[model samples]
Structures are given as C-alpha cells and as structure tokens.
Target: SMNPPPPETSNPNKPKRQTNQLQYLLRVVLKTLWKHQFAWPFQQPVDAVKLNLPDYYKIIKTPMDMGTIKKRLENNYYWNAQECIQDFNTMFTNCYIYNKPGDDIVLMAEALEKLFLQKINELPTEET
Candidate 1:
C-alpha cells in the first residue's frame, strides 16, 4: 500500500511560539557572536553582499548537534565562515553527529558569520 502525505493542520499558536523562539535564539547567538570576536583572523574581512543577515539566518537554520559546537564555543581562532561551513558539512554530511530534537548548528555558524561581518564593518575604508 502507498502512503499519502500527512494532512495539513493550521495552528496559530505554533507559529507564535516558533517566532518567539527564533527571536530569543537570535539574541543569544548575537551576544555569543560578539563575545568571541577576538578569535577572528586579524586581517580578514567579510563581504557584506555575500554575507547578508538573511543568508546568515539560512545558514544557521541547518541542523546540527549543540554539543559539537558548544565544545568549540570559546575558540576565538575558529571565528570564521570556513569553520562554520566545515561544522555544517561535518554535522550534516561527512559524519553525522546526531542532535537532540531542538539542537541546531546554525546558531554557532550564524554567530560566527555575524561576528565576522561586524568586524569587517569596523575596518577602515582604506583597509577594506
């Protein structure tokens, strides 16, 4: 027997909760992102057009285990996009690290990107 798609059920409360969670998550991620700015590469600068806020959100929304990133949380040396990209690949593809239902790798990656973007913005125009 073939299985049909699940039925759609609208629940307004669900969306409200989800949005609230997202806002809280972004706030925490932003703070964490700023706190670890010293780890960013001294001379590297990010491209704003290539690293937009929406893109950062998308990148952070990808699935991942919190433990893996949490371990790397205080590592200032890893405050770069490539590191997060690596984490994304490792968690989702290379060797899957199973995450809890609500665990997300995006927070760390998004934070990293945001941190880098902020640092880039702080640079002098001539140095950019």
Candidate 2:
C-alpha cells in the first residue's frame, strides 16, 4: 500500500504537516468537560511561582482562551490523550506532596480522562 505524499503548498504560511483534526476535536471535548471542573483548582491559594511551574499556573488559570490551550492540546503536552491523563494525575500527586488540595476544590481528573480521551483518536479530518 502506498501512503500519500505530504501536502505541497506554495504558500509559506500553509503548514507542511497539520496536526490531525481529531486533535482539535479532542481539545474541544476536554475544554468543554473541564471548564467547570478546573475552576476550583485555579481559585485555590497555592503559590504557582514557588512551585517552579508558572507556565502551568498560567495554563490552569486561563480556560477561555481556547486558542492558546488548543495548541498545547494539539501539538504538545496534552496532545496524547493518555499523556494528558498522566499530567492530570501528576498535578494531583505532586501538589499533594507539598500541601493538600484546597478544601473548596475537588477534581474528577481520572474520570474525565477515562470518559473523554478514550473516545478521541489521532485521525485526519476533512476541511471545514
């Protein structure tokens, strides 16, 4: 079987390789699922800079700027659904080591991973 050659675009701005549209779908799925769930975590009084994860704090703090968050979901840390789950677990575990999760915050992080990521895959999509 012959796999198709990569897209050849004369336009410089056009990406040579695009992340799968399934990635975007997965992004939407997660953001929609966690928009409310992530609230309590962000509201807590934890010292983000002290933890040496200011970028992570910024990420967790901003939920509506889907543009920024979407890229991470599409191409980086949150790209692989399982890796995404691992990240959520890592946050819970690591944060607990220094101080307990805030009283007002509770996350169904594991359930969110099991429920959403399991349904999405790295498949191509037709143009929108």
Candidate 3:
C-alpha cells in the first residue's frame, strides 16, 4: 500500500510539436524586441554597484531582462508562451516602479511594450 502505481508513458507527440512551433514564434518576437533602440535599458540585469543603483535590488525583488529571457528561451526554461510574456511584463513593471513618471527610460519602456504587444498579436492563431 505504500507504493503507488506508475503513470502511463504512452503520451503522443502532438503537444510536443505544438510547443516547438510556439517557441519558434516567441523567438521571433524576442529578436524584434532586442533590435529596438529602447531595448538597451532592459538588456541585462540591473547592476547595483556599477550603475550606482544601490537601492535597485531593494526596490526590485524580482529583476528580469532580455538577456535572461534569451537564455531561458534557449534553455527551454519556459513551460509556455504565457510565461515568457509574464517575464516581459515583470521587466516593464520594474522600470515603471523604479523610474519616475515621464522619464526617458519610462518612455522607452512604453514604446517597447507597445512594440512587443504588436508583434505578439501578429503571431498566427493556433489551431484548436
């Protein structure tokens, strides 16, 4: 009674193929974002000491960036496309929180967010 029966291992590969398609689409979106001029600010993790932003870590508990996302995507770390979107949101939200309203960085983040949304919407609809 202590041991449980093993689960079925006969799953089909249809879902796996769908996942590959989604990853490819997301990679396209990521590349577009990376090429934008506004992308510089969010390209890498915030450097507290190098940038003289000692309070950055205190303010942003969960820092995110494009480089990190790129690595994660390459490593297949995301379970689904939504998780990738969430990381993007986190990066933008952190910018909003740490930077003042109407700042240049904020404006850039806004532009990037708009572009990100547009590109993702242009992705082909998945078949049911």
Candidate 4:
C-alpha cells in the first residue's frame, strides 16, 4: 500500500483531519457496519433507520461536495431504499472488499472478516 506525507497549512476555509500511520482494522470495520442498514437491530436507538447512511455516505464520498457528511454527523435524517443500496454497494465494493486506488482505505477489513464468521455462527434466529 502507498501513503503520502501530511499536508501543512490548511486554507482556513478548508481544514483536514490528520491520519495515522497504521490503524487497527476492527474499529473501521465496526464503524462501517454500524453505518449500514443491517446494523438496524443494534443501532435502533440512534434512529438508525432515519439516518440513511448509504445515501449520506454517497454525498460524503465525493471530493467535490462534503456537505452531506457534516449534515449527517450533525443530525439524523432519512434516505430511500434505492439510494441506500447504491451508496452502500459503492462503499462495500470500493472501500471494504477492495481498497481501489483513490478510494478511502477501510482500515478494519480484517476485523470485518472475523465479524462475518461470527454472523454466520449466529445465523438467522427468531431472537437476537
């Protein structure tokens, strides 16, 4: 994997977050999963259903616009099924399954793999 040095001096108008040299993959995996529709069962109290992450992530992924990301984090909102699926698909395929060039790396890919195994173990049950 390739990485670059940090940028100094923000535009003041535009700021950026610092990056870590290496991060545990589990945290990122959990964050991504928690942002997914499937996390509904666990994240319901946050009104996860109304906070359509997939659609919201789409807007955030674009380099041209960052409004959606800020808006989403600041408050809860709703998104349609179609938009959600499309956005989630993009994130999963590009970020998680494969760290495509120019795509944000999912530091928690390994963690997600283990979680998938656990999910299979639990399987589909009447009760969670």
Candidate 5:
C-alpha cells in the first residue's frame, strides 16, 4: 500500500505578504517624516553637550530619534507597523518633555506629530 501526503498544503507566504505591505507603507511614511522641514531636530540624537542641555539625558531616559529608527528599520527590528509608529511617538514625547511649549523645537515636534498622525490614518486598514 502507498501513503499519500495531505491534500491541503499550508500557505506560509500569506501572513508575510500582508506584513510586507504594511512595512512598505511604514517606510514611505517614515521617509516623508524625514524629509519634512521640521525634521531636523529629530534627525539625530540630541547633542546634549553641544546644545548645552546638560540635563537632557537625565530627563528623557528613553531617547528615540529618526536616525535610530531608520537604523532599526534597516535592520528589520520592528515586528509591526505599530512598533515603528510608537518610536516616532517616543521621539516626539522626548522633545515635548525637554523643550518649553513655545520653543522652536517643541513647535517642530508638534508639527511633525500632526503630520505623522495624518499619514498613519491614510494607511490601508486590515480586514478580518
């Protein structure tokens, strides 16, 4: 007697295909944010010594920046789009905590945050 394999084979690529789409969308959004005029402040880690903000690291323990996020994306560290967006939120929050309300950097952070939210909302919603 001969044994046959199962009729229904697993589709391993399905989940990854959807995930790739989301990742691509996130990359586009991230690039847009990086190109924005207000993105300079968030482009790299805060130069506490150069900026003369000695207490910068003391206040913002978790310092997230667009350069770091770009590295993470290149390394495929983000498991989902939400994780990527969270990094942006973290970066913005750090700016808010360290800068005054009317400060130029804080204002830039606010503008970038609004642009981020708008871009995120434009992403395609997943269907169950």
Candidate 6:
C-alpha cells in the first residue's frame, strides 16, 4: 500500500485565520520594534543595505523560538519585550565581531551564549 501524502483538506478558513494571526502578531511586534533603536552591534551604525530587516531577522530566527515570541505578541503584545530581544541580539553580535582576541571577546561570547540558552529554556511550550 502507498503512503498517503498527509491529509489535504481544503479549508479556506485556515488560511485566513493564519494570515490574521500572523498579521496580528508580527504587526504588533515589528511596529514596537520599529519604535526603539535596534540593539547593540546594531549600535555602531549597521550598513542599512548590508543588514536589512530580514537580515537581522535571519540571524535571530535560528536560536530564538519564533513560536513563543509569536504567542507572547499574540497575548501580551508588549513593545518592551520586542525591543529588549532585538537590542540584545544586536549588542551581542556587535560585541563579538568588534572585540579583539582577548577577555572582551571571551566574556561577550560567554554572555551571549548564556543569554540565548537561558532565553530558549524560558520559552513557553504550547502546553505550558
């Protein structure tokens, strides 16, 4: 017997709801993020063309859990949370690149790695 290619039911409502959720969630987060200055490494003036919004997002999307972030914006919709995260990422990457071969680099690396780990651990599971 051939395996089915998953369940493919056409529910138009599903797409609409998803779009609405994405719009509702991302709009709030991006808007609030737009208000504040982007975080560190972001501080020394980023190459606007070199680092577009999606570029910054690309780096962040990996380590950070977008699902939890989406949920937070869904419920609380706090501007501060968005700002803090963006800034923190910007700062860490910036520090990492700018620092020389010394304690500064090591310290920043440790701090940055720890922060990412801690943040991930704190993420809210759907059941949580």
Model 4, TM vs. native: 0.24
Report model 3's TM-score to 2 decimal places.
0.78
Each model's backbone clash number: 2, 0, 0, 3, 0, 4
Candidate 5 lDDT over 1-128, as tens digits, reads 12223121234343323365356544777788899999987887777767777777778777888877776666556557776677888998988888889999888888888888888888766644
TM-score of each predicted structure versus truth: 0.24, 0.36, 0.78, 0.24, 0.77, 0.30
lDDT of 2 by residue, 5-113 (tens): 3222134453333444535554565465546554344323344456454554444432222232344354543323444444444444544443434432234433444
Q: Name the candidate that leads on TM-score.
A: 3
How high is the CA lDDT of each candidate model? 0.35, 0.41, 0.73, 0.32, 0.72, 0.40
Lowest summed lDDT over 10 consecutive residues: which window, candidate 6? 1-10
What shift in Å separates residue 38 of candidate 4 from its native position after superposition? 16
lDDT score, candidate 1: 0.35
Off by over 4 Å in 3: 1-21
Report the Cα lDDT for residue 53, model 3: 82
Best by lDDT: 3
Candidate 6 regions off by >4 Å? 1-80, 125-128
lDDT string for model 4 (68-111, tens) is 22232223222222222233333344344324344323434334
Predicted candidate 3 versus true structure: per-residue lDDT over 6-113, tens digit per residue: 222223432323364356545677888899988987787776667788778777777888877876666556556776788888999999999999999899999999
Clashing pairs in 4: 25-107, 25-108, 50-77
Lowest-lDDT window of 10 residues in candidate 3?
1-10
Worst 10 residues of 1 by lDDT: 39-48
Error in Å for residue 102 of model 1: 18
